[PDB]
Short mmCIF file of C-alpha atoms and ligand atoms in Angstrom, two decimals:
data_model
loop_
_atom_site.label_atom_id
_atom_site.label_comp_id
_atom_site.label_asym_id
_atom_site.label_seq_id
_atom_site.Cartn_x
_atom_site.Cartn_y
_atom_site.Cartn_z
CA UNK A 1 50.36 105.37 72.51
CA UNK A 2 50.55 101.65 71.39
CA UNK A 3 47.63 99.86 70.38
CA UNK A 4 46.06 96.75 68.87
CA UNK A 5 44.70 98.95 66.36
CA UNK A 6 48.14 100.78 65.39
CA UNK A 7 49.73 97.50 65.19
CA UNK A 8 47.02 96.13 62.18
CA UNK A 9 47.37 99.78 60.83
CA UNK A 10 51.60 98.94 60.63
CA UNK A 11 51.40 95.36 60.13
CA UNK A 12 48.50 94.62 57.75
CA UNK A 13 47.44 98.29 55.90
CA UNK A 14 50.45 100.05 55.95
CA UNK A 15 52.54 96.75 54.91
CA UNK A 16 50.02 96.06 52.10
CA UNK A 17 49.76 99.57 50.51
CA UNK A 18 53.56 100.49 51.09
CA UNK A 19 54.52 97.38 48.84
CA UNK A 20 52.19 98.23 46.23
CA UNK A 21 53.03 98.63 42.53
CA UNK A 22 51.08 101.60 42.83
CA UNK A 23 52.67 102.84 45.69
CA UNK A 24 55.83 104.65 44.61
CA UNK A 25 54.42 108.15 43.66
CA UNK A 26 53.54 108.02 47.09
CA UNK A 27 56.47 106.75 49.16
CA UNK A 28 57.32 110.61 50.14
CA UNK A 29 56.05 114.01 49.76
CA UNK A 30 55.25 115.40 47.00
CA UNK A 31 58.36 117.72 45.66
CA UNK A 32 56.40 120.60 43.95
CA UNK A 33 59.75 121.43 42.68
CA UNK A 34 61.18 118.67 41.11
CA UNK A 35 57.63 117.85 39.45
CA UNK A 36 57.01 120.87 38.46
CA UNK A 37 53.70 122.44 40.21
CA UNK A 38 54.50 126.01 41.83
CA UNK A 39 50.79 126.07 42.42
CA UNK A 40 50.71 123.02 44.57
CA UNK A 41 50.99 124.20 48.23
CA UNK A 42 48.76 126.95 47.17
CA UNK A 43 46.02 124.47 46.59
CA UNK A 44 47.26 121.55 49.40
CA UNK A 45 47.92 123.28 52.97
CA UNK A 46 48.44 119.77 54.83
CA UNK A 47 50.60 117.78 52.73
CA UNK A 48 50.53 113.69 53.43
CA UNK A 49 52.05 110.82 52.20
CA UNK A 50 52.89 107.11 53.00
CA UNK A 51 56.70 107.60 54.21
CA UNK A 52 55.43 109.88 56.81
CA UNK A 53 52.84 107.63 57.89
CA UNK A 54 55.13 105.13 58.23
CA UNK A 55 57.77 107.18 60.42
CA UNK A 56 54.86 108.27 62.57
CA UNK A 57 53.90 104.41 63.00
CA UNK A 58 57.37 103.55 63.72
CA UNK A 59 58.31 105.96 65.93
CA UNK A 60 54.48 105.80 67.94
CA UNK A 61 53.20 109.19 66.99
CA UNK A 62 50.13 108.07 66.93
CA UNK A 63 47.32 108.04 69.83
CA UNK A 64 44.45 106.57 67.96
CA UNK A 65 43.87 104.70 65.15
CA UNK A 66 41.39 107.26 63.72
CA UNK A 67 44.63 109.54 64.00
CA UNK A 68 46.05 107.44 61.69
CA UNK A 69 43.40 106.83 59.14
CA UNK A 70 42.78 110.56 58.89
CA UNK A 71 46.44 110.87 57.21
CA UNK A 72 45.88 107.99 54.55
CA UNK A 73 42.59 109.67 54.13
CA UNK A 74 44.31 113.34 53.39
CA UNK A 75 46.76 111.60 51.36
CA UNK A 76 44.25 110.16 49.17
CA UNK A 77 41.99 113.33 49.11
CA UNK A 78 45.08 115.93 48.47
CA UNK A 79 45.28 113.73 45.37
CA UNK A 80 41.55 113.80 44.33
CA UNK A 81 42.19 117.43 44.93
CA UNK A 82 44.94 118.67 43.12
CA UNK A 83 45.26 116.61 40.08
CA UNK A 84 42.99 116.86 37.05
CA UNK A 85 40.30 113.76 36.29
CA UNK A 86 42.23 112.12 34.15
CA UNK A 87 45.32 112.29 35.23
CA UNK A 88 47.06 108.50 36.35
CA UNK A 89 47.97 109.83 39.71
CA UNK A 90 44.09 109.72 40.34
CA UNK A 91 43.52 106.07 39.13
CA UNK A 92 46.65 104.63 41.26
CA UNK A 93 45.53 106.40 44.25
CA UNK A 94 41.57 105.04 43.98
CA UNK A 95 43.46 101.50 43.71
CA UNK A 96 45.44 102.18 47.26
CA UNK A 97 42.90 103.64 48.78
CA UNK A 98 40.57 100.64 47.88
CA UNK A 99 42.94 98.24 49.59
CA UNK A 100 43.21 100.58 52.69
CA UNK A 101 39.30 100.81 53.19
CA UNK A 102 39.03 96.82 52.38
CA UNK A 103 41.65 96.05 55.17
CA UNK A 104 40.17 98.97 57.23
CA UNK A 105 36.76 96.81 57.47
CA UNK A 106 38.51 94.41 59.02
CA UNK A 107 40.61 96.08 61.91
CA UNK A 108 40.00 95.41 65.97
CA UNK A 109 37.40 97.23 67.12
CA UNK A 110 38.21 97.99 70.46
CA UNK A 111 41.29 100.31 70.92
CA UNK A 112 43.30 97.96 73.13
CA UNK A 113 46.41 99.97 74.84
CA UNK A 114 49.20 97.57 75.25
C1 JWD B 201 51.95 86.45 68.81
C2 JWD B 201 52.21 87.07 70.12
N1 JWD B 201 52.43 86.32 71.21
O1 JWD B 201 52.64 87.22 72.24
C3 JWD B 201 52.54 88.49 71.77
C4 JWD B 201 52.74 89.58 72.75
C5 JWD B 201 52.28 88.45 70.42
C6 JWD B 201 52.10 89.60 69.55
C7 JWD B 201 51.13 90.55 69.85
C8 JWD B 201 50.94 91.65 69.01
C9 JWD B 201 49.91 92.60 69.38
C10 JWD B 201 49.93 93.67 70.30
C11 JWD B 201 51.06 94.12 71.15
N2 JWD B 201 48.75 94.30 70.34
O2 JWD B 201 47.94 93.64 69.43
C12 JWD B 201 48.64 92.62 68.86
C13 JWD B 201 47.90 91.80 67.87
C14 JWD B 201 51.73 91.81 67.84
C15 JWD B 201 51.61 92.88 66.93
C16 JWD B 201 52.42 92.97 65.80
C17 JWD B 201 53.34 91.96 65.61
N3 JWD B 201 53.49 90.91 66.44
C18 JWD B 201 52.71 90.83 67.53
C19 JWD B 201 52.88 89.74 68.39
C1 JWD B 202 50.91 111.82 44.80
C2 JWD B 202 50.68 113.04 43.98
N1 JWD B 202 49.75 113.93 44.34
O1 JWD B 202 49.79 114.94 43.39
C3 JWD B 202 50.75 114.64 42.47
C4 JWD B 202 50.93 115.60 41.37
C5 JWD B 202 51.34 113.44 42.80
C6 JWD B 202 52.41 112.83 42.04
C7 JWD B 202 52.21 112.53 40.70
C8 JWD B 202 53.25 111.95 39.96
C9 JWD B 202 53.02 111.64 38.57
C10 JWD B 202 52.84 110.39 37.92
C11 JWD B 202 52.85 109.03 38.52
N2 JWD B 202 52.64 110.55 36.60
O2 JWD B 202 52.69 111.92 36.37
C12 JWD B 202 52.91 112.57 37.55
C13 JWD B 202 52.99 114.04 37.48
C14 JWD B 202 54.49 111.66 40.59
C15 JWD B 202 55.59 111.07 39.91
C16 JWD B 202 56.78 110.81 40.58
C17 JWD B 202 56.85 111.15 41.91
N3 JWD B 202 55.83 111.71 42.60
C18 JWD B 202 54.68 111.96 41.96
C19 JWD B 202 53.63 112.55 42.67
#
């Protein structure tokens, strides 16, 4: 499906967070081996991150924009999750996830097929 609402998703959330200075930890899964955490898929059973939403934008994976938004949203929350309270993983993902709730405010209401 191709909508109105994917598009913004793409065009305006995806293009702002993707670009982000924040953003790089992000860009792809998380490799539990090169960082480290054997632990990690133990505690995370749905891994997410902003390279895959992308693809899945790209290639029209999506067949809602809710669809959508649920990924960013386990992206953010597998974060909030795993890592400890202090850790700077947690502050650069409240920043993103900030911008993607602003911009969400403001997408079309009305899923619009085209
Ligand atoms: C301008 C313009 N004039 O004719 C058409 C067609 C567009 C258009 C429409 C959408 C579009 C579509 C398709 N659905 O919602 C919107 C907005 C776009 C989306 C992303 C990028 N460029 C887009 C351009
Ligand atoms: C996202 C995410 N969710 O859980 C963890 C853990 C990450 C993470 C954290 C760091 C990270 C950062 C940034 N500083 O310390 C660590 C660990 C990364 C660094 C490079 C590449 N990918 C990284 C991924």
């Amino acid at each position: 499906r191709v909508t109105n609402q994917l598009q913004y998703l793409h065009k305006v959330v995806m293009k702002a967070l993707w670009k982000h200075q924040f953003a790089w930890p992000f860009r792809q899964p998380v490799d539990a081996v090169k960082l480290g955490l054997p632990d990690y898929h133990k505690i995370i059973k749905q891994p997410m991150d902003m390279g895959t939403i992308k693809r899945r934008l790209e290639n029209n994976y999506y067949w809602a924009a809710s669809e959508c938004m649920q990924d960013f949203n386990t992206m953010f929350t597998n974060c909030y999750i795993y890592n400890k309270p202090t850790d700077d993983i947690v502050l650069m993902a409240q920043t993103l996830e900030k911008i993607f709730l602003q911009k969400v405010a403001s997408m079309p209401q009305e899923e619009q097929e085209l």
